[PDB]
Amino acid sequence: SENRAQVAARQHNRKIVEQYMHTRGEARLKRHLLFTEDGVGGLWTTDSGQPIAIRGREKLGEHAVWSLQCFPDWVWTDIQIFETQDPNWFWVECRGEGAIVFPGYPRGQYRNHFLHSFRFENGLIKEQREFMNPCEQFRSLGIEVPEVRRDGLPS
Amino acid sequence: ENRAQVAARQHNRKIVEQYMHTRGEARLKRHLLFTEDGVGGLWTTDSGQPIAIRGREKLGEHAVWSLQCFPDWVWTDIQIFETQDPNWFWVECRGEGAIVFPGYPRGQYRNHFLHSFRFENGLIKEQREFMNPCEQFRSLGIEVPEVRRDGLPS
Ligand SMILES: O=C(c1ccccc1O)c1c(-c2ccc(O)cc2)sc2cc(O)ccc12
Ligand SMILES: O=C(c1ccccc1O)c1c(-c2ccc(O)cc2)sc2cc(O)ccc12
């Protein structure tokens, strides 16, 4: 029963995506338990143009400790979960917001729009990726954002 | 209800595929894939606000500009995602081409993109594209700031 197996996987995986997106506060310290042992998470949109990937359930648990310090009240909001034709692949559109307490920068407030990709293997997350506009993180840190000159562009 | 949803999803998928494969002079007619009041544009920009192109007529005018400033643009590595909403699709892809912006040196622009497509009565009501603007800055020779990482776990 291929269809029955796919339906069951999609239903379970959706529950894991929901749980991930609703994980807040001290529960963030256990969010890595939603991943496979070799699971990868992280931020795919950065100033360098390369992802910052956090590799392995153990490193993901270590990152959570840092995350609670530097984003102490972070929440995802406006959460819209998208199932796909692949029962093991979901997308989420949402916003996120919270204080940002990055080392060596003034404390700030960070808001952004996010897309998340979740790929599953055997009931847990194998790959999580988040995509945002880094310009908004720059603004939250007081970093000057470059501006494309629009004089010559239609408007 | 289910027959209607299946029919919508199958037709809408063909439109997404056509959009993503549209290149060259055919870009001048891509706006015909939209409703009269359809919206398209770039949701990730330096200002933090979208640059939305409102209405099928304005979309057709934007295509003319697009063919001048992105004269050979191609979408590659296209992955189309249907969803539980037969009228909502997402696409993960890359894009590449020359960038010829007014008052900047000619460059080569490459980026990773996500696209959202929402449909109404067989045509695109809302198209949005999401990318990392730092790569467009680099293509234009604009300096990209660097978040200092010394204090961050490595
Ligand atoms: O915000 C993050 C981040 C990274 C990965 C996962 C979640 C995040 O929020 C970040 C960096 C970072 C690197 C190492 C580390 O241990 C903690 C954070 S560097 C950097 C540069 C940018 O332009 C924009 C964001 C960032
Ligand atoms: O590239 C675009 C663009 C905008 C909308 C749809 C497709 C696009 O590719 C663009 C701008 C633009 C504005 C008016 C116009 O008529 C033509 C282009 S300004 C700007 C500033 C940024 O930081 C990054 C990108 C851009």
TrEMBL record, chain A:
Hydrolase listed as a keyword: no
Entry-linked Pfam families: PHZA_PHZB
This protein's record includes keyword Lipid biosynthesis: no
Domain of life, per lineage: Bacteria
Gene Ontology biological-process entries: antibiotic biosynthetic process
Keywords assigned: Antibiotic biosynthesis
InterPro entries given in the database record: NTF2-like_dom_sf (IPR032710), PhzA_PhzB (IPR004964)
Family assignment from sequence similarity: Belongs to the PhzA/PhzB family.
Name by which UniProt lists this protein: Phenazine biosynthesis protein A/B
Automatic annotation (TrEMBL), chain B:
Assigned keywords, A-Z: Antibiotic biosynthesis
Natural source organism: Burkholderia lata (strain ATCC 17760 / DSM 23089 / LMG 22485 / NCIMB 9086 / R18194 / 383)
Family as reported in the entry's similarity comment: Belongs to the PhzA/PhzB family.
Any single biological process term in GO: antibiotic biosynthetic process
Gene3D superfamilies: 3.10.450.50
Alphabetical list of SUPFAM superfamilies matching this protein: NTF2-like
InterPro entries: NTF2-like_dom_sf (IPR032710), PhzA_PhzB (IPR004964)
Record's protein name: Phenazine biosynthesis protein A/B
